[PDB]
């Protein structure tokens, strides 16, 4: 009939988009520089709304994974470069009886450019390689090395991702929501929750649990080359420690250049390891094999094994504990074939010369942590990898790092608001 | 009324969502509260906020709708855009369903609103020339 167009401004309509999200806080991650998080976190429920999500096409995980890499390189700029340490090392074994951590001495530069000094230090064997006894730092024939500033914090801080004005973040309050599909119960938030950027491997640490039951993800579970993300609903307690009482020695290697070395080990020499409750891990491995039958069959066998090969950062549980990077042999956790007081101890190693991420260009020297190291964490997730009939084996994997933040950013999605709507109604303007 | 909040009626009828426009009209620009990572990235987001906002105000200005939340015009509703009844729209499909059906013709309508305004102040220009 007499229908003319009428412009509406401020209508609830959005589109899929990817913008530059900013961080909010309440260390390396420079969380002091983010906007102070609002004490009132407004969450508005979008009743009658269904939205299509996909944690694998999600861009917040691609942006954050670069926002952590760009945070790592940003924090090591003013820190001391350990380039003169790439010198011929004279190493022995530290007195004991396995000869792991070495005792190396070397002619080192001083504050005066014409004076040398014969100083010594301890290096784990993972940081050195022989020549033909003579050694050298592992990174010398590859890249330069920057020592981490001993005043920045390696501690994961709850980081909040927020969308700019005119954009919005879409939550998903579905408590059985697998990664993809349409979330039936959707709400909107100005900022995400407290994301702890815990760099982990194989076993996701300190993550957010799942309500109701434990779900597993993976974009296509039948594609064996897709990392399966399992998310526990109850937390399995894991305790880790480096029992050796270490010492840190400051070595002046120039005008203001002070390399911090491992002096000696006070007291006993022991072995760094981790503990989990075998009962809690047995029931949790039961919870994972429960949901695994809904995708593979109620009669097929499910086998667990350790890694099949690759780098050190993937074949072992690698993480941070008090400020030092463990590499925990997880073969004692994945050794159970399922069909139908306790304490499991993992032998962990320690590295100081790491590259992190997987970039070829720069390695970081972590100065040794003084005192005895022990940290208590929860493992909340798991990154598995299946291997030709009706019996599926599963092994841990940790190829890509951005699968970590993806296990926390699956509940979110960025959309842009376009508040311009044109719709007809029997309305016209005068003359 | 019920304070559903920001985008509270995204799944509701176009007749119910049209009565709560000043809710999404506030939070489209939010507000106020130097070289690092988020520092440069925050300023890049603060500029983009006012650009997308001024585009929607510039478009509203050249249509004669500057200051309106609901604005009536002269362009008649072409049946080729959507040959749907008035009751099967405002008391049925949502604003999200509406934008998908009009996504094609939405550019033609934006041009019809511009000249419909220029050929209105030009007519009023002659209306006050005496």
């Amino acid at each position, epitope marked *: 009939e007499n229908l003319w167009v009428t412009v509406y401004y401020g209508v609830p309509v959005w589109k899929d988009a990817e913008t530059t999200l900013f961080c909010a806080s309440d260390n390396v991650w420079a969380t002091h520089a983010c906007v102070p998080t609002d004490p009132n976190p407004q969450e508005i429920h979008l009743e*009658n709304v269904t939205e299509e999500f996909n944690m694998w096409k999600n861009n917040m995980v691609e942006q954050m994974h670069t926002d952590i890499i760009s945070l790592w390189d940003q924090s090591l700029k003013p820190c001391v470069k350990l380039t003169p340490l790439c010198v011929t090392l004279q190493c022995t074994n530290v007195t004991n009886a396995r000869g792991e951590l070495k005792n190396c001495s070397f002619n080192m530069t001083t504050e005066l450019r014409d004076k040398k000094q014969k100083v010594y230090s301890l290096f784990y064997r993972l940081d050195v390689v022989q020549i033909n006894k003579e050694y050298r730092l592992i990174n010398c024939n590859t890249s330069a090395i920057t020592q981490a500033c001993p005043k920045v914090s390696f501690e994961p801080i709850p980081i909040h991702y927020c969308a700019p004005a005119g954009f919005a973040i879409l939550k998903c309050k579905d408590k059985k929501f697998n990664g993809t599909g349409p979330c039936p119960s959707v709400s909107t938030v100005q900022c995400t929750h407290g994301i702890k950027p815990v760099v982990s491997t194989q076993l996701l640490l300190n993550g957010s649990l799942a309500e109701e039951e434990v779900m597993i993800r993976s974009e296509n579970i039948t594609n064996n080359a897709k990392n399966i993300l399992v998310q526990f609903n109850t937390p399995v307690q894991i305790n880790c420690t480096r029992p050796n009482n270490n010492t840190r020695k400051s070595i002046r290697i120039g005008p203001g250049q002070a390399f911090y070395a491992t002096g000696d080990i006070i007291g006993d020499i022991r072995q760094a390891h981790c503990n989990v409750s075998k009962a809690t891990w047995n029931e949790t491995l039961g919870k994972v094999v429960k949901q695994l039958r809904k995708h593979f069959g109620n009669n097929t066998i499910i086998r667990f094994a350790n890694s099949s090969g690759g780098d050190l950062e993937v074949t072992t549980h690698s993480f941070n504990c008090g400020g030092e990077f463990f590499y925990c042999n997880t073969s004692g956790l994945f050794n159970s074939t399922w069909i139908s007081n306790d304490s499991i101890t993992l032998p962990c190693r320690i590295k100081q010369i790491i590259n992190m991420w997987q970039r070829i260009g720069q390695a970081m020297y972590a100065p040794p942590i003084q005192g005895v190291i022990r940290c208590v964490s929860n493992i909340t997730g798991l990154i598995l990898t299946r291997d030709n009939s009706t019996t599926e084996t599963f092994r841990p994997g940790g190829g890509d790092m951005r699968d970590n933040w993806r296990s926390e950013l699956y509940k979110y999605k960025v959309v842009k608001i376009e508040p311009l709507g044109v719709a007809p109604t029997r309305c016209k303007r005068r003359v | 009324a019920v304070f559903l909040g920001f985008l509270g009626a995204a799944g509701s009828t176009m007749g119910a969502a049209s009565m709560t426009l000043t809710v999404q009209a506030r939070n489209l620009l939010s507000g106020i509260v130097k070289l690092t990572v988020w520092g440069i990235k925050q300023l890049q987001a603060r500029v983009l906020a006012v650009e997308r906002y001024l585009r929607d105000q510039q478009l509203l200005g050249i249509w004669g709708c500057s200051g309106k939340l609901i604005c009536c015009t002269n362009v008649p509703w072409n049946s080729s855009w959507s040959n749907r009844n008035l009751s099967e729209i405002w008391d049925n499909m949502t604003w999200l369903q509406w934008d998908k059906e009009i996504s094609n013709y939405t550019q033609i309508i934006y041009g019809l609103l511009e000249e419909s305004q220029n050929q209105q102040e030009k007519n009023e220009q002659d209306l006050l020339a005496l």
Partner: nanobody
Amino acid sequence: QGQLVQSGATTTKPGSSVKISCKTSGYRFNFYHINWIRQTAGRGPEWMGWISPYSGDKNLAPAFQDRVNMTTDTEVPVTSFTSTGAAYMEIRNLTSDDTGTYFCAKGLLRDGSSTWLPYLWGQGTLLT
């Protein structure tokens, strides 16, 4: 703009109860009422009652309030505006007078003065 397929033509005898289904598709199942209408051999058509898949609210005629068992599941959402729901139908004191063809019906609008009016009908189910 979707289908509302029902069950078959199950014929029983008086005194018993019969279950009738109504599987929806092509539309948001929780946005529209589900009416139930029948046309028996002895009268014309008679409005039985509707139920809200969203509010879970019922309103049925007094001629069928003490006989009709009417329930709905919860939709399995396919897309943002598509879903797949189900509406169930059962009677109590069955006679040969209730012999007729039964169908479900999706509501007309989502608001206004004709929110529940049976617009999109099923296919029909022959009773006893």
